[PDB]
Amino acid sequence: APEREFIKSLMAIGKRLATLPTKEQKTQRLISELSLLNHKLPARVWLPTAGFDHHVVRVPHTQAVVLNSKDKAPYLIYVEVLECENFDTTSVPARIPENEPWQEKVRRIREGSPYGHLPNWRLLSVIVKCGDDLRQELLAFQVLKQLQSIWEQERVPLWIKPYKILVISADSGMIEPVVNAVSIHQVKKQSQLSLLDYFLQEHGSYTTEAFLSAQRNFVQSCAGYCLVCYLLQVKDRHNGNILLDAEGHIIHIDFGFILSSTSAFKLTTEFVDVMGGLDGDMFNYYKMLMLQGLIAARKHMDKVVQIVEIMQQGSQLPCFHGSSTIRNLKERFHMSMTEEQLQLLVEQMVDGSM
């Protein structure tokens, strides 16, 4: 499989970075390795996350990043590709010698690239995870796609961003990154502000449309991911694993600890202050969206449970501790309860989150 030799050498770099002790040391090896890998490009190799036929021409080593984590060495790359009509039939491009928002990232790399002038030039971006098992993430991705359209169909304006997972092996794979987004940890570290103060500074003040729309996005995304976290039993929830985007949505990531596999969905005081406090209109709206999404989820529960059963049946997954996993999942929809008892459930759920 020469067409995968790009993939195998990428996963090798990842395993090597897991040997190095510090981010600084991982960065310098990543650069060194990618620089070496450009000597083997351009080639008849793909990056499987893309939706179109292409050949990988170049990997700019200066723009690759080692990401934070406890154990492993996850790293982000920006892969340059020339698009083609067909993968197998179109000739591999000749090698042309050498000498933040997405549009700027694209512009700056394109201007610096020897391939950037060409009409078929495209830039793709992927996070490479080696060591970790992304079947957990991939199940979550599918449940997210399903829930998104359950809320689309019943007119409920909850908001979640499913991101594409690609399982290469049992202990490796690829995640497509969220582009306009940084961790809540990083926002707080860089700004030295509360989340409310960050909103007020970055978007605008309490009565501006910029704020109110960003606050609306924040509320809708929290309520969305709160239900996701309850239904899927998502653990490992911290400001490292929650992103904030340029529009003011939150994005939960890293659904590796779900179902039968402390650390639950915490609604912090600083989160509640972004919604104008407990005795407030947008917090009442947050509680409404949780109730509205849950009734929409109850009616369409077969469409989710289908997706769960299809991904466990051909695995020996750690989250699947036998048929208790679907049994407990089903019970979390609470079909026997009334809508009045579901209000009390939502209220008890929010109290538990605080």
Return residues touching ligand EMW (CB under 6 A). Answer: 67-69, 74, 127, 163, 175, 177-178, 181, 183, 185-186, 240-241, 243, 253
For residues 330, 259, 252 and 178, what is the CA-based torsion angle, rounded to 10 degrees? -100
Q: What minimum distance in Å lies between the beta carbon of 199 and ligand EMW?
A: 19
As measured in angstroms, the least distance from the Cβ of 332 to ligand EMW is 25
Q: CB of 240: closest distance to ligand EMW in angstroms?
A: 3
How far is residue 157 from each of residues 19, 125, 207, 282, 293, measured CA to CA in Å?
Answer: 45, 29, 22, 14, 9
Nearest distance from residue 60's CB to ligand EMW, in Å? Answer: 18
CB-wise, 158 or 187, nearer to ligand EMW? 187
Q: Is 17 or 181 the residue whose CB approaches ligand EMW more closely?
A: 181
Looking at the Cβ atoms of 134 and 219, the one nearer to ligand EMW is 134
Nearest to 229 by CA among 175, 158, 167, 314: 158
We find the least distance from the C-beta atom of residue 264 to ligand EMW, in angstroms, to be 17
Phi–psi pair at 180, nearest 5 degrees: -110, 40
Q: By Cβ distance, which residue is nearest to ligand EMW? A: 240
CA distance 161 to 228: 11
Structure tokens given for 235: 């653990």
- Please name the residue ranges forming H helices in 195-268: 195-202, 209-232
Q: Nearest distance from residue 176's CB to ligand EMW, in Å?
A: 7
Q: Which is nearer to ligand EMW, 17 or 289 (CB)?
A: 17
Contacts by 105-108, CB closer than 8 A, 24 or more apart: 105/63, 105/78
- Of 134 and 290, the one with the shorter C-beta distance to ligand EMW is 134
Q: Smallest gap, in angstroms, from Cβ of residue 82 to ligand EMW?
A: 25
User: Counting every residue, how long is the chain?
Assistant: 354
Nearer to ligand EMW among residue 30 and residue 253 (C-beta): 253
Helix (H, G, I), strand (E, B) or coil at 58: strand
Q: What is the full DSSP assignment across 239-257?
A: TTSEEEETTS-EEE----S
- Identify each DSSP E strand in 48-153 by its residue range: 54-58, 65-66, 75-83, 121-130
Q: Which is nearer to ligand EMW, 42 or 224 (CB)?
A: 224
Closer Cβ to ligand EMW, 68 or 153, answer by number: 68
CB closer to ligand EMW out of 23 and 95: 23
**In angstroms, what is the minimal distance from the CB of 117 to ligand EMW?**
28
Q: CB neighbours (10 Å) of residue 52?
A: 12
Name the β-bridge partners of 80: 58, 123
Q: Which residue has the tokens 């779900």?
A: 258
Q: What is the rounded CA–CA span in Å between residue 338 and residue 325? A: 24
Provide, rounded to whole angstroms, the least separation between the CB of residue 347 and ligand EMW.
31
Query: What CA–CA distance (Å, rounded) separates 286 from 225?
Result: 11
